[PDB]
Amino acid sequence: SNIYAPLYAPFFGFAGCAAAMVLSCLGAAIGTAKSGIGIAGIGTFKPELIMKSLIPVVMSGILAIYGLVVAVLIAGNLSPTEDYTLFNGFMHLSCGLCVGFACLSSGYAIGMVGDVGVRKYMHQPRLFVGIVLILIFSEVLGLYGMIVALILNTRGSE
Amino acid sequence: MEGVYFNIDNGFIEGVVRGYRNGLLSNNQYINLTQCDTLEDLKLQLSSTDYGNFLSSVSSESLTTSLIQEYASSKLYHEFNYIRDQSSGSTRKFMDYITYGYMIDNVALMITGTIHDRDKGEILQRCHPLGWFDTLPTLSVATDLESLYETVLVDTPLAPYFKNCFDTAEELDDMNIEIIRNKLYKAYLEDFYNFVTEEIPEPAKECMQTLLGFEADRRSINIALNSLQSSDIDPDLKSDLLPNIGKLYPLATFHLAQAQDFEGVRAALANVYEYRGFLETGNLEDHFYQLEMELCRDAFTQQFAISTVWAWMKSKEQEVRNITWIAECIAQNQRERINNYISVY
Amino acid sequence: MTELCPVYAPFFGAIGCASAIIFTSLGAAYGTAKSGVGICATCVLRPDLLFKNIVPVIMAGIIAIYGLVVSVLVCYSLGQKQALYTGFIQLGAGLSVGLSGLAAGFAIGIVGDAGVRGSSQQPRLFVGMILILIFAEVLGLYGLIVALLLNSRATQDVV
Amino acid sequence: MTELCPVYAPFFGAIGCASAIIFTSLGAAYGTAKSGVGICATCVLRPDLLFKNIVPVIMAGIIAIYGLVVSVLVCYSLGQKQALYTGFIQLGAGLSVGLSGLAAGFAIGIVGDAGVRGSSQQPRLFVGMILILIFAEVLGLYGLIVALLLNSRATQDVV
Amino acid sequence: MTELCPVYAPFFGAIGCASAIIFTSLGAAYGTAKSGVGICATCVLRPDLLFKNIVPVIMAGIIAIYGLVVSVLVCYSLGQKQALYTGFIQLGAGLSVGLSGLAAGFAIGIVGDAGVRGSSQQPRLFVGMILILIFAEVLGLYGLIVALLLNSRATQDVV
Amino acid sequence: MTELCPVYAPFFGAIGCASAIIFTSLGAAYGTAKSGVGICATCVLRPDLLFKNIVPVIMAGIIAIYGLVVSVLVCYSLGQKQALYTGFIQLGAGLSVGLSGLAAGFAIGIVGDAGVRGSSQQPRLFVGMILILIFAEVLGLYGLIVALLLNSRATQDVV
Amino acid sequence: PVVSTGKAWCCTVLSAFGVVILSVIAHLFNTNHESFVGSINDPEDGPAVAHTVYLAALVYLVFFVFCGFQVYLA
Amino acid sequence: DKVATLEQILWRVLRGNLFFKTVEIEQPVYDVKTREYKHKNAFIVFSH
Amino acid sequence: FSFSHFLYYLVLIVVIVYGLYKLFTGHGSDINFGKFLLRTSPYMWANLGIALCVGLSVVGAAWGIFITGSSMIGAGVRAPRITTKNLISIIFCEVVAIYGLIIAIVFSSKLTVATAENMYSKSNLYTGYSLFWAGITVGASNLICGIAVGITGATAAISDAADSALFVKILVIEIFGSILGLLGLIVGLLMAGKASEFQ
Amino acid sequence: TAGFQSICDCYGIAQYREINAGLPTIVTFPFMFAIMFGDMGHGFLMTLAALSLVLNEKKINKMKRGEIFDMAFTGRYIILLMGVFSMYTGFLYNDIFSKTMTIFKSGWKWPDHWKKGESITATSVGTYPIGLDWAWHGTENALLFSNSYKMKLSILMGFIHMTYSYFFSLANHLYFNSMIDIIGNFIPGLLFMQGIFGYLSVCIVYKWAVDWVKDGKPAPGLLNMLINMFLSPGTIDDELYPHQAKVQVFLLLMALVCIPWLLLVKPLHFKFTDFGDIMIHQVIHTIEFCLNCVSHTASYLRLWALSLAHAQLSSVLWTMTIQIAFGFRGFVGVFMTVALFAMWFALTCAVLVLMEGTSAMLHSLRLHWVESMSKFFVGEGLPYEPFAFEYKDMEVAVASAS
Amino acid sequence: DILSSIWTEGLLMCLIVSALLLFILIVALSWISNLDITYGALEKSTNPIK
């Protein structure tokens, strides 16, 4: 039939869905757990700082939303009836790899900085804007990955 | 990460040591201990803490400051022996390395008492029951340091630490034993630092490295401030007593090794940032105790770490020292300096 | 399809377009994490040096911007019927900018940690930290240049 | 295409053009990181020796310049219809300059760290540090020479 | 033989029938070994708590009973002339119950060791140990359920 | 030969017949070695408890007897002209009894060491050691049962 | 003959369940229920297995009346 | 518990000219100062 | 030394030499990864998906359960009132295996029997690929979610054993970390949404 | 009512004049045990074990026992109710010692003639009055009916338990004069969880009530339409009832609008009478009440779970030991069935009553601690414990000091 | 259009499944090999200061 849509083509698009969900979930979980260790480590001495110290946990929960958006946008294009060439499968796998590894690296950075910045916050209350500033610099990496996956998604369906 | 493979063996030990940690005395409890009039009031006030029913079944009239510090130390030692029995692998090794540093002090104490012809049983008590090593009372024979070493010390775990101690080859007096003991503790700290660097996982690794750094720096400043007594010491014969670990070795133990007066030590410590706040004021030992308790407090913020055992050990020892000082000030009617305990919690 | 333009040809372009932003994000994440641990350990004592020490984190983020630029420029050249020459050029450009950004991010992280911890107690060391960090930044710049010079030849006279 | 000029032929040229700047950037990053840790540990006590000790970082950056030169000269010889001979020559030139620059960067980093830490307390050791660093620089220079002599033969009488 | 029923088809069924009892025996052995070390360390001081602390060893043996049940039910469905569908279903059922029993055995071993050592000195912790061990026992139960629901479909309308 | 009975078919039967006695001998050797180190460390002080503590070594040898039984029963079913079904069944039976015996041997060794060292100073712990060792013995028994139920079907209606 | 009391109940209770259970199973073998023998498998004959299950019920009865008088002595 | 320690020390002290010999006391010997049952044995060491 | 790195380097060298030799002959398309995907039975991919789903979900559940259970047992020696309170931290790790059960029950209704004719059709290959990747997606997400919720549960047990007022403030972090398994659940249901049965 | 009160007080001591949770526990705890323990003979053995403890109460409350027989004796009425309700449940499952009963005429009819080895089907000549039909015994697709049967049983019973325990919150709020809690917490949660999960139960019962073969319509999938109610709204593959294309969208938007109607009224009424603590606590209560609807109604699959596995393990135990000794004519067969019945009774009393009763008992306890008392049980109060005189037990007091 | 004459599809399916099961067996045996005994609770110590 068609030499452009052979029947092994959905394997790569489903691999893109799997990578975009699993590695974004891994980055979000690393960030959340590693920051929560420091948040509950400061909790014995100064328990009045925990409700402001939940910035790195909320910050590293947006990364799972990035992976969620890109995974549902890839899975909306797959169907057992459509044409679906191999070019679309390579683009979907590249979308998944972009979002997954960008969110994994971003979640690792958020976890490290959030742990040390919350643990060393029980001493200096003027250290908070630096925490929020470096966390904002760590958050944008997953955003860059999601931007290139949105562009690859709208490029691949042509 | 660190919370992944830790709990498999050490989760129960970590939880029990945190439960021991929650019974550390805070400031209000020390103030309530300060407000006691007699010593039975101190007993009744300590009864409502984690200690309680520890001086039960003693007496109402045989209550003495020495008896209180004996029993408050024995509770510490039984808790440490329980936690050491419940461990294996690297944690068992780590706690044996905690024990060896008191074994060194027992060696020096037994030799020093053997020089002055004291009794075996007098030196066998007040000899810190945690660093035992079964062949310890045999150190009271055969005064010469070689005839200790080729007979009983090679089969102890303190055997690889005498690699420097065979320079002088005569009978010992009180300064030779201290030179020996300082070489022991130097080689000991460097053995335990190279142990922590290669086997202990990372969040406990950095905490144990900074705590061992402070141990080495405190003993370096103490040797530099005690070596300017009435003797002549070559800087080559003094720099073999300052450990090669800490934040003042790469270049600041050099000026400690080359120093004559107290102002030489002040100028030596003047460039290290954490120090040179100490020598221009009062009790120079309380600054080391306060900084040790602040570092040990900072060690309790890491959760998946076996630095908690060392930090709790040192905190509970400071707690026993504080209760002994308060009991002395109560029993001797010397309430002027009763508030000189060190409380960080 | 064609012997010059087979069907497996967009695979290398998609792998290059992914790997650019992937390895530059890993380098930027290492630099941001190491420098942020250094800042949070330093600025407990001198909170007034907090916004002065923020420079290594920014110089780590510029590497991720480099990877984003190369990924967009590669992504706007993919096609279903391209040659193997174009896919090989796109894969080479992606690997160039990605691994150059990874090396530059490792250097920026280590030098920024040491420089912040040193400049907490020596105010003259900040300009030396900036000089060494600029020498660590030009490596990712060189990778960006090699990637742009490859990408400018991906579609010249390709049949 | 042709038996002398197959379709997989630009793959080796793209891999060589990438690997040159990749391995020279890794060597330059190791040299810059190790020497910068040495400078930041040294110049807390002697901030007046800060701009004197900057030499190993510059000699590490020259290696990345070597890799950039070879990557540009290889990149301006790629083509869709080249031979396997040209791709093999380009791959060999890239591997030569890359791994020579990696070895030279490791040597420059280690010698520069030791030399800065030693010359903090011995002012006559600085010229010996410069001599040993020049002996570490000529290795990457030799890799650059072998890469240029390969690249000069990549297109002579190729059919 | 047939395209639906090839000759290599009983291999997957034999591998599943083996792997069920293999991985459940590994999980039960880890649970029994870890809990038995905990019991033998505890009951030197309290020998009267010896037959009270025997519960984690029994809850580890129930996992091996689960694996034995699935291995017998798979073993009574093998045949020389079965389909690939039946072999794939049998392999999936074996892997399900085996790896679920392995995870449940690891959890039962670690929780049973900690719970016996804790309940030696706190008599109220025994019921909390039983609650957490029941939460560790339902995982192997879930693997058993998935294996039975797979095995009930291995021979429905297979040609 | 035949499509149902190829020539490579006795390979799986020979591998199963070997692997049964191999992995049960490894499990029995670990159990015997660990328990014997425990006995030799214990019975320096209590030489009267020497023949009482010999139980874990015997319960380790029973596992090797299980492997010997399965190896003999598989070995008396090999043939030159057997099917792949028979070889797959024999390989599955061998792997079942071998890896179950390996897990049971590890558990018997560790529990026997801890139990002998504990029962040197607590005479009531010996019966608890026997209970936990019986729970470690039934795992190899379950592997033996699965191997016998596989081997009973290796030659029923095979063409 | 040391104590022999804590093992008397373990056999009397076992036999007391065994008599009743094998008696009702043998009665269900005898009248062909088509759920104990209603397929091509395990039994075929019918009352020929009801025979030996009633025999086993009798053997459990003599277990029960033996061990039920040894517990009576305490 | 201390017979091996005795013979180790006396071998390292008598340099290799020891004639140590021990026979066991079968029953435990009950202690008063502590409460351990203390399996004991006798010894004899010859020298000049 | 380092036997695993020696195995990895040996496999790498053998694969590089083999692929370079298949170039060397001129037969580089004999390593045909796409023809392997056609000629492989779709029921293998579907059953690996279902089995690896439920297995990885149970492994993540067990991991989280003993992480929080060791710390809760250890912290309950001095303060035994933490057990009935922090039961919920083991509830949160146990629901992961129930999500794996729900996925297995949904996916096992699509394992029908196909004809030898149109066995490798477009819909059957689509169904095998979708069930495989959806199963391992939800299984790996369940694994990671169980690990993270277990770590936070251990830390919450220690903090509640300190004093009673802290577990309300740390349980919020477990509420954050427990949504990730539900994300994996939703996307695993959505990847296999349009896949038919095997016909 | 003492043992069930000690059950419910182990979790938490209730607030003053709050509704006691130990009063419905008396019967809802052994029944949720009984669903997982659905056997006639095992519940019969459990009743015999309970009556061995209930029939001599006066002899036992004067002895010193230790920690196991204590939990046996203080919960004797729990074990009695568990055994009796397990008799009723095992009667409705048609299961005694993993065998059937044949006490009524069947609703299925086998064909007239067949060769020995023909796969045949039954012809549905009526319905069976009480229990499962005994024509499902061997039948080689008994699990295919029983699983989809008892899963729906577990979902229906779990929903009725949750929606009964939720009305105790209304009976609390009406008693404490707390009319803002009704309009802020009861109505949003009631509409949100009824309009999602009780609609599923109504659809299960309605799919049971409709004959699909006689009407010639394809029977839909309730799991498929539950997923497509949220993940693809408006599109329906198989129709269940006539105007359901709009009811799905209406229930979806009502469950949607209950999300901003919750987390808004209870704080902003405190504002006009925000604070931060009420607002953040209400956000936590909304994100915790929701996502426990899905999780808690998924958690009632354990009633199906343990029932299926208890039935399967008891069936394998019957076919493994005593089934062997039925074709063994001779004098060896007498001793063979003697020894094999001894082994079978020892296993069905050891691993199958004692070791699966403790599990399902604490599963019926988890279903009341977590899924049931998170909807009405407020929590913290101080227990009564008056000053009274007691015997002191000297050797406990010596161990209490030392 | 066969894949290979020696690396057929049945042989590759069997090898992929066997490699997965060998991987998990190796992992689980590495869990079993790290398994210690805590000898300190099985000994006795006198310590005559205590």
Angle at D134 between CA D130 and CA D136, to 5 degrees: 115
CA distance B150 to E8: 72
Sign of CA dihedral J62, J64, J70, J73: negative
- Smallest CA-to-CA distance from A18 within E89, I62, I44, I190 is with I190
What span, in angstroms and rounded, lies between the C-alpha atoms of A96 and A145?
9
Domains detected in chain I: 7-192 (1.20.120.610)
Counting as contact any 3 or more CB pairs under 8 A, the partners of C are: A, D
CB of B53 within 8 Å of a chain J CB? The answer is yes
Which residues lie below 8 Å from residue F27, measured CB to CB, with a gap of 6+? Answer: F60, F63, F64, F101, F102, F103, F104, F105, F106, F140
CA–CA dist I160, B192 (Å, integer)? 34
Q: Distance, in angstroms, between F17 CA and closest chain E CA?
A: 15
Interchain pair A17, I191: CB under 8 A: yes
Q: A113 and A56 in contact (C-beta within 8 Å)?
A: yes
SS3 J381: coil
Q: DSSP labels for C78-144?
A: --TT--HHHHHHHHHHHHHHHHHHHHHHHHHHHHHHHHHHHHTS-GGGHHHHHHHHHHHHHHHHHHH
**Tell me, what DSSP letter sits at residue J116?**
T
Give me the residue from E126, E131, E153 closest to J362, CB to CB: E131
Q: Report how far apart, in Å, the C-alpha atoms of F6 and of each of E92, F2, K12 are.
A: 27, 5, 18
Set of chain H residues whose Cβ sits within 8 Å of the Cβ of K46: 34, 36
Residue J310: what residue type? H
In angstroms, the CA F133 to CA F128 distance is 9
Which one, of J356, J145, J144, lies nearest residue E66 by Cα? J356
Name which of E106, E110, E116, E125 to mutate to probe chain B: the one with the most chain B Cβ atoms within 10 A of its Cβ.
E110
Spatial separation of the C-alpha atoms in residues E104 and E59, rounded to whole Å = 10
Q: How far, in Å, CA of B271 to CA of J237, rounded?
A: 80
Do residues F84 and E8 make contact, with C-beta atoms less than 8 angstroms apart?
yes
> Of C134, C150, C66, nearest to C100 (Cα)?
C66
For chain E, helix (H) and strand (E) counts, in that order, are 4, 0
What's the CA gap between C77 and C155, in Å, rounded? 9
D/A Cβ contact: 3+ pairs below 8 Å:
no
Identify whether the C-beta of residue K37 lies closer than 8 Å to the C-beta of residue F113: yes
Dist CA A5 CA I34 (whole Å): 12
In E, minimum Cα distance to J358 occurs at E134
Q: Is there a contact between I167 and I156 (Cβ–Cβ < 8 Å)?
A: yes
Beta bridge partners of I22: none
Helix (H) or strand (E) holding H43: strand H41-44
- In units of Å, what resolution does this entry have? 3.2
Compute CA distances B86 → B13, B306, E130, I155, whole Å. Answer: 7, 14, 21, 21
Enter the tokens of residue C63: 């590497």
Phi, psi of G59 (to 5 degrees): -65, -40
Alpha-carbon dihedral sign for residues B34, B39, B41, B46: positive
**Helix or strand or coil: residue J96?**
strand
CA–CA separation, B18 vs B307, rounded Å? 12
Buried b (16+ CB within 10 A) or exposed e, K16-49: ebeeebeebbeebeebbeebebbbbbbeeeeeee
Q: How far apart are CA J314 and CA J320, in angstroms?
A: 10
Q: Chains contacting B with at least 3 CB pairs below 8 Å?
A: A, D, E, H, I, J, K
Give φ, ψ of H21 to 5 degrees.
-155, 140
CA distance J298 to chain I (A): 7
Name the token pair of I155.
């830390």
Cα–Cα distance, C20 to C91 (Å, whole number): 9
Chain F residues touching residue K35 (CB < 8 angstroms): 106, 110
3-class secondary-structure state, position H44: strand
Instruction: Please state, in angstroms and rounded to a whole number, the distance separating the CA atoms of residues I131 and J226.
Output: 19
Residue of J nearest to E156 (CA): J141
Query: Which H helix or E strand runs over A39?
Result: helix A10-41
Q: How far is CA F24 from the centre of its chain?
A: 4
CB atoms within 10 A of CB J182: 15
Positive or negative, the CA dihedral I86, I87, I92, I96 is positive
Chain A residues in contact with C36 by the CB 8 A cut-off are 109, 112-113, 116-117, 134, 138
Which tokens in the block code for residue D97? 């300059």
Task: Write out the E strands in K1-50.
Answer: none
Tokens of D60: 């590490």
Interchain proximity G56–J138, CB inside 8 Å: no
Residue F27's Cβ-side half-sphere holds a number of Cα atoms within 13 Å equal to: 37
Segments in H1-48 forming alpha helices (H): 3-13
Q: What is the DSSP letter of H23?
A: E
Q: Residue J136 and residue J140: Cα distance in Å, rounded?
A: 9
> From CA B186, how far away is CA J54, in angstroms rounded?
72
* Residue I84: other Cβ atoms inside 10 A: 15
Q: Which of C40, C50, C66 to mutate to test the interface with A (most CBs of A within 10 A)?
A: C40
The DSSP string of E45-101 is: T-GGGTTTTTHHHHHHHHHHHHHHHHHHHHHTT--TT--HHHHHHHHHHHHHHHHHH
H21-24 vs H41-44, strand pairing mode: antiparallel
Q: Which of J206, J216, J211, J194 is nearest to J241 (CA)?
A: J206
The DSSP 8-state label assigned to residue J99 in this structure reads: B
Among K25, I154, B8, smallest CA distance to E34 is for B8
**By the CB < 8 Å criterion, does F126 face chain K?**
no
Domain boundaries, chain F: 1-159
Whether the CB-CB separation of B95 and B83 falls below 8 Å is answered with: yes
- Spell out the alpha helix ranges (H) of chain D: 10-42, 55-75, 84-119, 126-151
Return d(Cα J354, Cα J350) in angstroms, integer: 6
- In this complex, whether E and K touch, counting 3 or more CB pairs under 8 angstroms, is yes
- Dist. CA D13–CA D15, nearest whole Å: 5
I152: left (phi over 0), alpha (psi -120 to 50) or beta: alpha
Closest Cα in chain C, distance from residue A152 (Å) = 7
Q: A84: left (phi > 0), else alpha (psi -120 to 50), else beta?
A: left
Contact (CB, 8 A) for F63 and F106 = no
Query: What is the rounded CA–CA span in Å between residue J356 and residue B186?
Result: 61
- Whose tokens are 């979930």? That residue is A25
Q: What is the DSSP string of A71-127?
A: HHHHHTS--SSS---HHHHHHHHHHHHHHHHHHHHHHHHHHHHHHHHHHTTTT-TT-
Q: Centre a 10 Å sphere on the Cβ of residue I21 and count the other Cβ atoms it contains.
A: 11
d(CA C116, CA C126): 8
Give the DSSP H or E segment for B11. helix B7-21
Contacts 24+ apart (CB under 8 A), J322-331: J323/G42, J326/G42, J326/G43, J326/G49, J327/G42, J327/G43, J327/G49, J328/G52, J329/G48, J329/G49, J329/G52
DSSP letter at H33 equals: S
Element (H, E) at I42: helix I42-75
Query: How far is the C-alpha of J270 from the C-alpha of J202, rounded, in Å?
Result: 38
Using CB atoms and an 8 Å cut-off, which of residues 381-400 of chain J contact chain B? 400
Tell which residue, E128, E100, E127, E129, has the closest CA to residue E113. Answer: E129
d(CA F6, CA F86): 12
Sign of torsion over alpha carbons F68, F70, F73, F76 = negative
Residue B35: CA count within 13 A, CB half-sphere? 7
Cβ E136 vs Cβ E57: under 8 Å: no
| Rg, Å, chain K Cα set | 25
Nearest to A33 among B3, B301, B302 (CB): B3
Put simply, the answer to whether B56 touches J400 (Cβ < 8 Å) is no
CA distance I58 to J51: 40
> What are all long-range contacts of G33-37, with beta carbons under 8 Å and residues at least 24 apart?
G33/J102, G35/J99, G35/J100, G35/J102, G35/J134, G35/J137
J79 contacts J50 by C-beta, under 8 angstroms: yes
Nearest CA in chain K to F30: K33
Residue B156's Cβ-side half-sphere holds a number of Cα atoms within 13 Å equal to 26
- Give the CA radius of gyration of chain D: 19
Q: Which residue has the tokens 């568990």?
A: J82
Q: Is the dihedral of CA B194, B195, B199, B203 positive or negative?
A: negative
Chains that touch E (3 or more CB pairs under 8 A): B, F, I, J, K
Distance of CA E124 to the CA centre of its chain: 29
The whole-angstrom separation of Cα J89 and Cα J86 is: 5
Nearby residues of C152 by Cβ (< 8 Å), 6 or more positions away:
none
Q: Which residues pair with H42 in a beta bridge?
A: H23
Instruction: Assess contact for J22 and J52: CB atoms under 8 A.
Output: no
| Calpha distance G61→F5 (Å, rounded) | 56
**What residues pair up with J96 in beta bridges, in sequence order?**
J99
Of the candidates E52, E73, E134, the beta carbon closest to that of J68 is on: E52
- The conformational region for residue J140 under phi > 0 = left, psi -120 to 50 = alpha, else beta, is left
Nearest to E137 by CA among A56, J361, C135, B314: J361
Nearest residue in K to B71, CA atom: K50
Provide the shortest C-alpha distance from residue B53 to chain J (in Å): 6
The Cα–Cα gap between F141 and F148 comes to: 11
Contact D22 C107 (CB under 8 A): no
Q: For A80-95, what is the HEC assignment?
A: CCCCCCHHHHHHHHHH
User: Which one-letter amino acid corresponds to residue H35?
Assistant: R
- Integer Cα distance of I30 and I23 in angstroms: 10
Q: Tell me if F127 sits within 8 A of E52, measured CB to CB.
A: no
What does the angle CA E115 – CA E117 – CA E123 come to, to the nearest 5 degrees? 70
Chains that touch A (3 or more CB pairs under 8 A): B, C, I
Query: Distances from the Cα of D21 to the Cαs of C13, C86, C88, D74, J251, in angstroms?
Result: 20, 20, 17, 11, 61
Q: What is the DSSP letter of I86?
A: T
Given a contact cutoff of 8 angstroms between Cβ atoms, the answer to whether F55 and F133 are in contact is: yes
Rounded Cα–Cα distance for residues C85 and C9 (Å)? 9
Cα→Cα distances C17→A88, C93, C141, Å: 14, 9, 18
Type of residue found at J92: L
